[PDB]
């Protein structure tokens, strides 16, 4: 049995694998899909949420692997349905999707989702999107997959207007998000802690699907600064961090140690 996190959540014995909820997903509204437990609010909790943004050109199902992932740890995970999820709008919106269903008086969601514990994440266009939305009050940390912030709707202002930590993962392979052009510029305007970890290698498309590599590092962060869970503090918090002794990372960090 391993420890509980601090939300009072199960704790897992691998960030990359199945957590122990089963999951189901379908519409959140037209505007969103949800992935998520098949059972709420089991021992009296409150499911905290990840916001999805995708990549330009994609739908929630090309993420189907990583967003049902995360759903499987308990998270309860909203994608927006768009195409183009830039501007951090269509994000936003799921947020305000899932108060309303949660404030309801009977429904899926209804009290059964902690609103004080949103996150965001996305690909690309989607991770500009995280950034974009990273700076409502209500997301409590990020973590951008491989984003593309120098066009689509992206507003390099909302670098250093963050609201939480930020996770930032990069391919160092990727020539369609450049890391130099996309990510840099962010870490550098960051006004909030950010753990930086550029996989060695990989390509853009590591992200898609399961998202590879990606995967059990972002569970970790989200359970981390989600969830409280104190088994995954060591992947990215001390001197000798998991991700900063592995060689496939390499890794900056601005206000952590």
Known sequence: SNPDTGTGFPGVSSFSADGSFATTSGSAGLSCTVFRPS????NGLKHPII???NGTTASPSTYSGILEHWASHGFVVIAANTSNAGTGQDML???DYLTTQNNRSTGTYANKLDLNRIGAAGHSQGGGGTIMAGQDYRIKVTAPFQPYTIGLGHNSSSQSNQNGPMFLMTGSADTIA???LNALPVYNRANVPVFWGELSGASHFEPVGSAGDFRG???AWFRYHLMDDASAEDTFYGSNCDLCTDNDWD???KGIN
């Open 217 to 219: 590092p972002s569970t």
């Open 39 to 42: 059972t709420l609010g089991a």
């Open 93 to 95: 919106n799921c947020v």
């Open 51 to 53: 916001v999805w943004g």
């Open 251 to 253: 890794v900056r960090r």
């Open 178 to 180: 450049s890391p130099t």
